[PDB]
Amino acid sequence: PSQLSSEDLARVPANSTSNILNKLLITYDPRIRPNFKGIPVEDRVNIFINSFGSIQETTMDYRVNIFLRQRWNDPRLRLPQDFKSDSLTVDPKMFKCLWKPDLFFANEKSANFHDVTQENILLFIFRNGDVLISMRLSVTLSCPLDLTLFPMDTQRCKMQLESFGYTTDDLQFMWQSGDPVQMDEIALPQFDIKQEDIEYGNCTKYYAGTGYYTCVEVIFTLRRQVGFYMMGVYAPTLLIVVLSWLSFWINPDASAARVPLGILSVLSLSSECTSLASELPKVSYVKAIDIWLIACLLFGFASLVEYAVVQVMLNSAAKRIDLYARALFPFSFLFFNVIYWSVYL
Amino acid sequence: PPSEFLDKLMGKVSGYDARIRPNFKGPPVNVTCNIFINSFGSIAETTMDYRVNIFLRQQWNDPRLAYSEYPDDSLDLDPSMLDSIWKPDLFFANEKGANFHEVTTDNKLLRISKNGNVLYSIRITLVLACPMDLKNFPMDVQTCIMQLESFGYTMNDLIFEWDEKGAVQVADGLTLPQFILKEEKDLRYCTKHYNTGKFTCIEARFHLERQMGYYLIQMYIPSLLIVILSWVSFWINMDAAPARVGLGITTVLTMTTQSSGSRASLPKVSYVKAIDIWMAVCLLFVFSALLEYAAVNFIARQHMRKLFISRAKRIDTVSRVAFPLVFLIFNIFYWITYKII
Amino acid sequence: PPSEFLDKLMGKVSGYDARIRPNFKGPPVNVTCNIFINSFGSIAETTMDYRVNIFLRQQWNDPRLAYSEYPDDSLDLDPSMLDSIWKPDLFFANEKGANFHEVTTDNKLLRISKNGNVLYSIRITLVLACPMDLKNFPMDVQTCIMQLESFGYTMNDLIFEWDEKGAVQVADGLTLPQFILKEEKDLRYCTKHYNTGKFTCIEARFHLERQMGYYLIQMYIPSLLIVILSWVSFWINMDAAPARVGLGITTVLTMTTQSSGSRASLPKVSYVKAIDIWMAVCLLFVFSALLEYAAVNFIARQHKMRKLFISRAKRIDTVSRVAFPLVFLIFNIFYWITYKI
Amino acid sequence: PPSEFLDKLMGKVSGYDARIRPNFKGPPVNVTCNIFINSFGSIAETTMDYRVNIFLRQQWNDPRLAYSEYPDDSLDLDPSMLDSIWKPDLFFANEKGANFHEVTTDNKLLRISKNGNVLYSIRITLVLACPMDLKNFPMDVQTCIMQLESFGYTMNDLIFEWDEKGAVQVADGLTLPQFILKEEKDLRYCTKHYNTGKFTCIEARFHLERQMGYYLIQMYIPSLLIVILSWVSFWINMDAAPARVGLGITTVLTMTTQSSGSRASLPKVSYVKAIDIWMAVCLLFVFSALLEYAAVNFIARQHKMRKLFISRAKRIDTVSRVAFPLVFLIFNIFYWITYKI
Amino acid sequence: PPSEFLDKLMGKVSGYDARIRPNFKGPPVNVTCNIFINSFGSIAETTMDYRVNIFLRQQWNDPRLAYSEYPDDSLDLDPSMLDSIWKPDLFFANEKGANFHEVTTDNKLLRISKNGNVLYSIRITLVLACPMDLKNFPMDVQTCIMQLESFGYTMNDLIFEWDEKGAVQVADGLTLPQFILKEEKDLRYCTKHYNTGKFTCIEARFHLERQMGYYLIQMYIPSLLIVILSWVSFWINMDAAPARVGLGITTVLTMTTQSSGSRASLPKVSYVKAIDIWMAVCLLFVFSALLEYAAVNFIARQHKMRKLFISRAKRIDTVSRVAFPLVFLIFNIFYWITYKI
Ligand SMILES: O=C1C[C@@H]2OCC=C3CN4CC[C@]56c7ccccc7N1[C@H]5[C@H]2[C@H]3C[C@H]46
Ligand SMILES: O=C1C[C@@H]2OCC=C3CN4CC[C@]56c7ccccc7N1[C@H]5[C@H]2[C@H]3C[C@H]46
Ligand SMILES: O=C1C[C@@H]2OCC=C3CN4CC[C@]56c7ccccc7N1[C@H]5[C@H]2[C@H]3C[C@H]46
Ligand SMILES: O=C1C[C@@H]2OCC=C3CN4CC[C@]56c7ccccc7N1[C@H]5[C@H]2[C@H]3C[C@H]46
Ligand SMILES: O=C1C[C@@H]2OCC=C3CN4CC[C@]56c7ccccc7N1[C@H]5[C@H]2[C@H]3C[C@H]46
Ligand SMILES: *[C@@H]1O[C@H](CO)[C@@H](O)[C@H](O)[C@H]1NC(C)=O
Ligand SMILES: *[C@@H]1O[C@H](CO)[C@@H](O)[C@H](O)[C@H]1NC(C)=O
Ligand SMILES: *[C@@H]1O[C@H](CO)[C@@H](O)[C@H](O)[C@H]1NC(C)=O
Ligand SMILES: *[C@@H]1O[C@H](CO)[C@@H](O)[C@H](O)[C@H]1NC(C)=O
Ligand SMILES: *[C@@H]1O[C@H](CO)[C@@H](O)[C@H](O)[C@H]1NC(C)=O
Ligand SMILES: *[C@@H]1O[C@H](CO)[C@@H](O)[C@H](O)[C@H]1NC(C)=O
């Protein structure tokens, strides 16, 4: 319960914080933007990033903890020569009597303030009417991820800052000249952030008849390390395929030896692929890892099939098939690797 | 000074009351609604629900707020005093949790024109209930329902209407892993009938289709290859007992691990799906592949000796073509009754 | 002016007090309750709870709120001033968490009739707790409990009663991943007794049944098929030692990899279930067949004229291939009739 | 009017101060506490905590709230005016999070007798922490506590005491998926000593036993049968090299499948549990059986004196038929006495 | 009464203002901080954070609150009017979420001594973020950071200092599922420099060590037993092709079963770890054991003086009996000396 002009007599504010703003907040309407019916106001926005992570492919979102700072000019808050100190601090419980821009994030799903011991918001007023507001947030933006080339993929996550109900004719947003987005020394479980965040130009929104709306955009680029999948998933599957070619050098009369070798190589590849179904993300379409696993199964499957060919030709030389398949199965598998790489790189 | 003009519009001196609907004791109120969708996802099979982030816009007319002396048409209202204006009591029927947004300010807006039209825009998140069935899990099409209805007004006071153009819009570049959201949407009327009267309601329908890329390459093609591998035994010489028995029982073990290992990525239900019938029949085919060899092995050396050998040789010759033909007949009937429904 | 009229019956001019029940120092007040279930599900055995979304309606009488001069039959109350009317202090006994709904406005409605009758409808969500017994895990029937009972009012003051007709209603088209909600419900009186006094309650019961269809085709039938592959070794000559040893083994391995890997699907329960007995006995049959070959292989080599020890080896296999299916059928008909009927 | 009488007692003319404790500058305030438990469960070893839903009652005395003119023995107080009455600053020492219940009204009650006796009953949902020891995971006893501290009053101001009868009560019909809650409970004083002073507390202790019916039939019995199958190879002929080698290496594969399949169903710890010792040495027995045949085959292959190596190879199989069961029987004696006595 | 006496010092009569720091336009105020830890845990690598429950105490001197007329000392403030006094602005730079406690009352306390000293104790929970490095996942040490920061005051106005004795205390009896909390803490100054100016910061560091008990007996020892079983094939007879092929293709199948089965228990990390080197190299040893047999098989079979082929075939097995165990001991020496000591 506060008013810009209310009847109350208190002699204790004497050149204090409380004494000076009440003279400033006389006939001051918080619902009227600065320079009403004139030049639109301009905001300088910079973002400091504290925490980054919790990147999820199930819900396509990621959580960021930020520091947000905005600056503008209010000619109605001139500071005269009567007060000696340059800056003033507004008590955080009473922002309802001051004008602030209506900023919001376009791709925001959930956000909250921080009040661990006090409210983490401050506001300064300078001599020339400049207003500085700084605050701490915990947003949950949305990042659409494309997992087609899943083991080696690059994702671009997006951050947007719009105005809810002011057009470009009244409120415009600007990045700071220097250091608009700053980073810290943190680590990520799977991805790897880059210190090349491009501050994309203003993606001003156009709507059906309402008018233009200002927005500013910053893009983060993420790359995925391939160390675990290349040695834990790729290398074991390569070794089983070599063991499928092992039966070409065994004698054809060993029916009880080549058959269990050819059927246990299929079981090893079948067990390896189905064990990773509970570890890889579920996207319900074909990824780059799934093409490798099914093509390796065909090579193990074709090794046992050709033995049935050579086993029936003998009881009807006919060892030229094993001589031909010795220089054919590794020769055709080499072309698949050249095709599989140099496409995904 | 637009702020002091509101006291002349509504207040103690004015007769405006927030508890009385416009056009009292007269015709009902027409409300026009639009919906803009920003996010869509989190299709949960276990809890039978999904999440959505929307923009809601409602328009109506209030004759008590008309004015003619103030020059400009637009007149915005501060969100801190939104309780002084009559608003419709819209709510979502299949709603399981919702909240507003206060990321920096209130994400609400109220605009009053000169004639009396009122524009009201808010931004909310929803967790809507969508019942679904997985009788044919890999080949299924599901429908999502989003209903908007009044809480305490009948036909005589409040009527909801969809917008003439641009009723439901979806933000560009929207994706979700499991499903594909089709562009066609249906706008229907579902008026509720109760023992107290008729309550207005409007609904929008979304059609969802699942992709067959991952299931065909992971659970169908490897299951087909193992069955073909079990037919190799019909070409091996019948005297190789350790080779034919070892091949037959290993294919059964390979099929079991394929079925048991794939249940992690499948949804948890308790009724039979279409993927379960494929795995059960494929297990039945490799079960019978080893069992015919016992008939071959027992008929041989049972005791003129070439008569019994020719009897056992005709079993492998007949089953060499009977097994692939039977599997083809089942394969045709499976895709006809499922992919073409 | 409805707002002006309500201020006369509720203001400081009137002697109405919100902390005094109607019919003070007299007969108790009747309360009639109704339940309309909108959502149902999310039944979890880890926490033993389930989430329900309902519409709750209460009706009683208040002689202090009687009017005759007003022309309107009913008067609606502003939800922001609901604290100035006496209301029953209903709450749920097995409640583990609840919320109100404010999706666009308050989802509450209070209406006062001309004769003093008060109608009160709210929309709330609940997380009720139910104990579950999974002893007969696939063929289990569970019971869910809803209780509505007072907080600090005895029999002399507040009495709860179900509605005469249509007391509990459920919306159509509700499905569950695991259970069937039957259409038959029970309405029973509960009355807690304490040292302080006697307290009113009302109870509503639901019955649930499992599908049981998926467990037959996924883990019962493959377990039945594997033990058939155990018995095929009795029709093979024992001179082929690697054939029968390699078939007796990898059948236990197939049974082991059938029991393993189902741990994720089965609920985490520290006591035995109906499914666990089936899997243990099925492992006992495939294990006991491998010892049968060890008995016949050791006896045959013991001989190495009369040569009657080889005929003794025949008698072990001839008896075993008839006794093994007969003893399995006896257990099978014993298992089903004492766990289903 | 009961409400009018309480206004005089709480009025500024009465001079009542909410911050001043009763019996100021005198004997300390003695409070009696009771606890009724509605639900129990959600025991998790991942975060070392469990959830509970209780009714909490406190009784004390206040000479300022003494009346004799009013005929009614007890006067109720509305929950909205709870800030006008001094209350103890009770809190739980080992809690992680808590909340009140507001399903329809505030679940709080306060009563004032004629002689100044004050009763105060509330309903609280709590999450309490408890360290756990899983060094004997298949069979272990866990103890969970509950502490009731005083935030800012020492022993000369506030003392907490249990009720002499019915201190802790548990509602009938509660069940847990893992543990069994014993009937007996322990009540004791655990008062704290700090540099600022001495602070009161009271405690309640619950003992839980984990039933091991599931672990016996799923992990111990199948592991026992696999080890017995490895001893079959000592009876097979030593000339059957593919038979004995194939049985030996597949038994290790079956044992490894049993161990890895059960890994996902155990709590995630970093120290050695009692189940891990059993699974490790059962792998050691089947591993040692395969090395036994390697010594037999290597000795018999020498010089293919002719019957000298055959007698030595036969003597190894002869003593291994009785050495392996007695060693395993000795270990089972030591395992089931250490973890049971 | 202390209530009316305190209002003289802090009311509208006195010139005290809550928006002015003590000792205005003078030396900076000094704050002494203490931390008492109640519960510790919930360490997760998927979100890289941990959760604590702490007691926080701050001490500073305010000369405007000095009184020399009350007979008693150490006045206590009600938490309702806690915003009428000056308090330092403190926050945690690692905080990802925090809350206060309202379990029964407000868990805050403020005390004002006679000379002007102010004591302020609160109880809060934090979700602090710490980076982690799992490059040596089984045997590794982690350090966690707890930072205390001033929001809008520089060195000219505010200064944070640790307590002289007992700065950080941990309650006894804390256990963790996988980590060991060292008793040696570190207190450091970590003042942050910005373009606006210097800001105060004080930090405390905890050291965590991971236990080796579970991984050594479940994933390290069974891997060592498997590669020993691959060396049995060097002693089997050379002509036993089905025996030696089966021992070596099942061993690879056994090894991949253990490696893939244990991977579910691992944290989800996209780069290499310490055990990933162990599992890959030990897989390479089983792979090389089967590959050398083909070199033995192809050399001996070639051309059915032909005695050199048989002599060269035995020379491979004789060398491999000692070369394979020797090179594995070299790998164990290098692995355990570069990931430890
Ligand atoms: O009339 C509208 C509807 C339209 O909805 C899509 C989202 C938008 C983002 N903000 C939110 C409020 C809105 C707006 C401001 C002032 C008058 C009308 C109005 N809107 C929405 C509009 C856009 C633009 C803007
Ligand atoms: O008497 C009732 C009960 C009935 O409950 C099912 C849900 C309904 C949806 N809204 C919520 C309030 C309600 C209503 C409005 C005015 C008077 C009585 C009344 N209700 C519910 C009713 C329907 C219709 C309506
Ligand atoms: O004195 C008591 C304790 C007892 O606690 C178990 C739970 C109960 C359910 N309600 C909650 C409040 C209570 C009650 C009402 C009026 C005076 C005393 C009082 N209680 C609890 C009581 C029962 C009954 C009732
Ligand atoms: O000065 C202190 C610090 C100390 O912190 C550990 C926790 C404690 C539990 N309660 C919370 C407040 C406290 C207390 C009360 C009155 C004056 C000082 C004061 N404290 C804490 C103290 C103990 C004891 C007590
Ligand atoms: O201008 C700024 C931006 C900068 O943001 C990173 C975080 C910081 C921590 N606190 C929060 C508010 C801040 C501050 C105080 C007074 C004037 C400007 C100002 N800030 C941030 C600043 C640092 C330092 C300080
Ligand atoms: C306050 O400042 C004014 C000038 O701004 C000065 O004249 C006056 O003396 C100061 N002190 C008081 C108590 O007003
Ligand atoms: C913002 O976009 C407008 C056009 O939409 C452009 O005129 C203006 O220069 C932009 N502001 C920038 C890039 O700072
Ligand atoms: C609202 O729409 C209905 C349906 O056409 C119409 O009959 C009614 O007149 C409309 N309301 C008004 C105030 O015109
Ligand atoms: C209902 O009210 C009547 C009269 O007020 C009285 O019988 C009693 O209070 C209630 N009856 C029952 C059965 O609850
Ligand atoms: C307990 O407290 C009451 C309340 O003042 C007091 O009268 C009584 O003597 C106390 N009992 C003791 C200290 O044993
Ligand atoms: C705070 O500590 C510094 C360190 O010496 C000292 O110089 C300063 O005077 C102290 N502040 C006060 C108010 O005494």
Q: What is the 3-state secondary structure (H, E, C) of chain E?
A: CHHHHHHHHHCCCCCCCCCCCCCCCCCCEEEEEEEEEEEEEEEECCCCEEEEEEEEEEEEECHHHCCCCCCCCCEECCHHHHHHCCCCCEECCCEEEEECCCCCCCCEEEEECCCCEEEEEEEEEEEEECCCCCCCCCCCEEEEEEEEEECCCCCCCEEEEECCCCCEEECCCCCCCCEEECCCCEEEECCEECCCCEECEEEEEEEEEECCHHHHHHHHHHHHHHHHHHHHHHCCCCCCHHHHHHHHHHHHHHHHHHHHHHHHHCCCCCCCCHHHHHHHHHHHHHHHHHHHHHHHHHHHHCCCCCHHHHHHHHHHHHHHHHHHHHHHHHHHHHHHHHCCC
Domain end residue (candidates: D158, D179, D211): D211
For chain E, the domain total comes to 2
Q: At which residue do the structure tokens 């009876």 appear?
A: D235
Q: How many helices (H) and strands (E) does chain C have?
A: 7, 13
**Mutation target vs A (from E96, E108, E121, E257; most A CBs, 10 A cutoff):** E96
Strand B158-162, strand D158-162: pairing: unpaired
What Å distances lie between residue A326 and A205, A320, E303, E304, CA to CA?
Answer: 64, 10, 19, 20
Q: Quick check: C210 and C178 in contact, CB under 8 A? A: yes
For chain B, the maximum distance between any two Cα atoms, rounded to a whole number of angstroms, is: 121
Query: Do D15 and D137 fall within a single domain?
Result: yes
The Cα E251–Cα E259 span in angstroms is 12
Among protein residues, the one with the nearest Cα to ligand 5's atom 7 is: A67
SS3 B339: helix
Residues of chain A found within 8 Å of residue E20, distances taken between Cβ atoms: 16-17
The structure tokens listed for D188 are 């004791």
In C, minimum Cα distance to B124 occurs at: C103
The Cα D338–Cα B216 span in angstroms is 53
The Cα E242–Cα B151 span in angstroms is 79
- What range does the domain containing A41 cover? 1-225
Count other Cβ atoms within 10 Å, centred on residue E76.
14
The DSSP line for C95-156 is EEEEEE--SSS--EEEEE-TTSEEEEEEEEEEEEE-----TT-TT-EEEEEEEEEEEEEETT
Domain end residue (candidates: D187, D211, D235): D211
| CB-based contact A308 B175, cutoff 8 Å | no
Count other Cβ atoms within 10 Å, centred on residue D80.
11
The Cα D332–Cα D339 span in angstroms is 11
The structure tokens listed for E52 are 């604590």
User: DSSP state, A77?
Assistant: G
| CB-based contact E42 D45, cutoff 8 Å | no
The Cα B40–Cα B37 span in angstroms is 8
Strand D90-91, strand D198-199: pairing: unpaired
Q: Is C156 in the pocket of ligand 9 (CB under 6 A)?
A: no
Phi, psi for residue B40 in degrees, rounded to 5: -160, 125
Q: At which residue do the structure tokens 């005791």 appear?
A: B303
Count of alpha carbons within 13 angstroms of residue E159, beta-carbon side:
11
Nearest residue to E301 (alpha-carbon basis) of C197, A141, A257 = A257
Query: Do B282 and B266 fall within a single domain?
Result: yes
The structure tokens listed for A14 are 């004497």
The Cα B203–Cα B145 span in angstroms is 7
SS3 B300: coil
What Å distances lie between residue A318 and A258, A323, E298, CA to CA?
Answer: 17, 10, 19
- What range does the domain containing D292 cover? 212-341
Q: At which residue do the structure tokens 């002893």 appear?
A: C135
Nearest residue to D88 (alpha-carbon basis) of D11, D201, D204, D203 = D201
Query: Which ligand is the nearest neighbour of the Cα of A49?
Result: 5
Asked if D95 is an interface residue toward chain E (Cβ–Cβ < 8 A), one would say yes
Q: Is A134 in the pocket of ligand 5 (CB under 6 A)?
A: yes
Q: Which residues contact B287 (CB under 8 A, 6 or more apart)?
A: B252, C225, C228, C229
The structure tokens listed for B165 are 């153009």
Q: Which residues contact B329 (CB under 8 A, 6 or more apart)?
A: none
The Cα C126–Cα C101 span in angstroms is 12
Q: How many helices (H) and strands (E) does chain B have?
A: 6, 14
The Cα B209–Cα B183 span in angstroms is 12
Count of alpha carbons within 13 angstroms of residue A211, beta-carbon side:
11
- Give the amino acid at B238: M
Ligand 2, CB within 6 Å, residue ranges: B 151-152, 194, 196, 199; C 36, 55, 57, 109, 111, 121
Count other Cβ atoms within 10 Å, centred on residue C267.
13
**Cα A12 to averaged position of ligand 6 atoms, centre (Å):** 13
Q: Quick check: B126 and B64 in contact, CB under 8 A? A: no
What Å distances lie between residue A325 and A205, A310, A322, B225, C13, CA to CA?
Answer: 63, 11, 5, 21, 105
Chain C stretch 277-306, residues whose beta carbon is closer than 8 A to a beta carbon of chain B: none
Query: Do E10 and E91 fall within a single domain?
Result: yes
SS3 A42: strand
| CB-based contact A239 E287, cutoff 8 Å | yes
Q: Quick check: C2 and B20 in contact, CB under 8 A? A: yes
Angle between helix axes B305-339 and B274-299 (nearest 10 degrees) is 170
Q: Is D59 in the pocket of ligand 10 (CB under 6 A)?
A: no
Domain end residue (candidates: B192, B211, B230): B211
SS3 D66: coil
Q: Quick check: A148 and A91 in contact, CB under 8 A? A: no
Query: Which ligand is the nearest neighbour of the Cα of E63?
Result: 11
Asked if B48 is an interface residue toward chain C (Cβ–Cβ < 8 A), one would say yes
Query: Do E133 and E195 fall within a single domain?
Result: yes
Radius of gyration of chain A, Cα coordinates, nearest whole angstrom? 33
The structure tokens listed for B273 are 């799906």
Phi, psi for residue E74 in degrees, rounded to 5: 60, 65
Nearest residue to A149 (alpha-carbon basis) of A222, A219, A224 = A224
For chain E, the straight-line distance linking the first and the last C-alpha, in angstroms and rounded, comes to 68
The structure tokens listed for D9 are 């007692």
CA C142 to chain centre: 5
- Give the amino acid at A116: V
For chain D, the straight-line distance linking the first and the last C-alpha, in angstroms and rounded, comes to 68
Phi, psi for residue E149 in degrees, rounded to 5: -135, 145
Count other Cβ atoms within 10 Å, centred on residue B262.
21
The structure tokens listed for A209 are 């008849």
| CB-based contact D257 C259, cutoff 8 Å | no
User: After which residues, if any, is chain A broken (C to N > 2.5 Å)?
Assistant: 316
SS3 C223: helix
Query: Do C70 and C127 fall within a single domain?
Result: yes
Q: At which residue do the structure tokens 């007796």 appear?
A: C248
Q: How many helices (H) and strands (E) does chain A have?
A: 7, 14
The Cα A86–Cα A323 span in angstroms is 92
For chain E, the maximum distance between any two Cα atoms, rounded to a whole number of angstroms, is: 122
Q: Is B334 in the pocket of ligand 1 (CB under 6 A)?
A: no
Asked if B190 is an interface residue toward chain C (Cβ–Cβ < 8 A), one would say no
The Cα C138–Cα C223 span in angstroms is 15
CB-count exposure of residue B307 (10 Å: 0-12, 13-18, 19+): exposed
Query: Do C125 and C160 fall within a single domain?
Result: yes
Q: Which residues contact C159 (CB under 8 A, 6 or more apart)?
A: C28, C29, C30, C31, C200
Pocket test for ligand 5, best of A46, A89, A134, A181 (most atoms within 8 A of CB): A134
Residues of chain E found within 8 Å of residue D98, distances taken between Cβ atoms: 101-103
Q: Quick check: A160 and A215 in contact, CB under 8 A? A: yes
Phi, psi for residue C11 in degrees, rounded to 5: -80, -175
Q: What is the 3-state secondary structure (H, E, C) of B274-286?
A: HHHHHHHHHHHHH
The Cα A268–Cα E283 span in angstroms is 13
| CB-based contact C152 D262, cutoff 8 Å | no
Query: Do B92 and B187 fall within a single domain?
Result: yes
Resolution stated for this PDB structure, in Å:
3.0
Q: Quick check: E174 and E181 in contact, CB under 8 A? A: yes
Q: Which residues of B142-175 are buried (b: 16+ CB within 10 A; e: fewer)?
A: bebbbbbbbbbbeeebbbbebeeeebbeeeeeee
In C, minimum Cα distance to D260 occurs at: C260
Q: Which atom from ligand 11 is nearest to the alpha carbon of E161?
A: 2
Q: How many helices (H) and strands (E) does chain D have?
A: 6, 14
Phi, psi for residue E259 in degrees, rounded to 5: -65, -45
Nearest residue to D17 (alpha-carbon basis) of E108, E67, E105, E4 = E4
User: After which residues, if any, is chain B broken (C to N > 2.5 Å)?
Assistant: 303
Q: At which residue do the structure tokens 């018995």 appear?
A: C231
In D, minimum Cα distance to C297 occurs at: D236
The Cα E30–Cα E337 span in angstroms is 49
Q: Is C116 in the pocket of ligand 9 (CB under 6 A)?
A: no
Q: Which residues contact C74 (CB under 8 A, 6 or more apart)?
A: C111, C112, C113, C114
- Give the amino acid at B234: F
Phi, psi for residue C64 in degrees, rounded to 5: -70, -30
Query: Do D20 and D42 fall within a single domain?
Result: yes
| CB-based contact A271 B174, cutoff 8 Å | no
SS3 B30: strand
The Cα B240–Cα C19 span in angstroms is 94
Consecutive H or E run containing B315: helix B305-339
**Cα B62 to averaged position of ligand 2 atoms, centre (Å):** 26
Phi, psi for residue B48 in degrees, rounded to 5: 60, 50
The Cα C119–Cα C114 span in angstroms is 12
Q: How many CB pairs under 8 A join A and E?
A: 151
What Å distances lie between residue E236 and C131, D288, E292, E308, CA to CA?
Answer: 60, 16, 14, 21
Query: Do E149 and E225 fall within a single domain?
Result: no
The Cα B17–Cα B15 span in angstroms is 6
SS3 D139: coil
Q: At which residue do the structure tokens 């109900």 appear?
A: A165
Nearest residue to C90 (alpha-carbon basis) of D54, D108, D104 = D104
SS3 B52: strand
The Cα D199–Cα D151 span in angstroms is 8
- Give the amino acid at E178: Q
What Å distances lie between residue B97 and B151, C146, D125, CA to CA?
Answer: 17, 21, 21
The Cα D42–Cα C88 span in angstroms is 32
Strand partners, A162: A104, A215
What Å distances lie between residue A104 and B104, B111, B171, CA to CA?
Answer: 6, 19, 17
Query: Do D159 and D197 fall within a single domain?
Result: yes
Strand partners, B123: B55
Query: Do B150 and B226 fall within a single domain?
Result: no
In B, minimum Cα distance to A295 occurs at: B217
Q: Quick check: A344 and A288 in contact, CB under 8 A? A: yes
The Cα C77–Cα C73 span in angstroms is 14
Q: How many CB pairs under 8 A join B and C?
A: 148
Nearest-CA distance D337 → chain E (Å):
22
Query: Do B200 and B165 fall within a single domain?
Result: yes
Count other Cβ atoms within 10 Å, centred on residue A166.
20
Residues of chain E found within 8 Å of residue D270, distances taken between Cβ atoms: 177-179, 210-215
Nearest-CA distance B35 → chain A (Å):
14
Q: Quick check: C156 and C20 in contact, CB under 8 A? A: no
In C, minimum Cα distance to B254 occurs at: C254
Q: Which chains touch C (3 or more CB pairs under 8 A)?
A: B, D
The Cα A151–Cα A192 span in angstroms is 14
User: DSSP state, A253?
Assistant: T
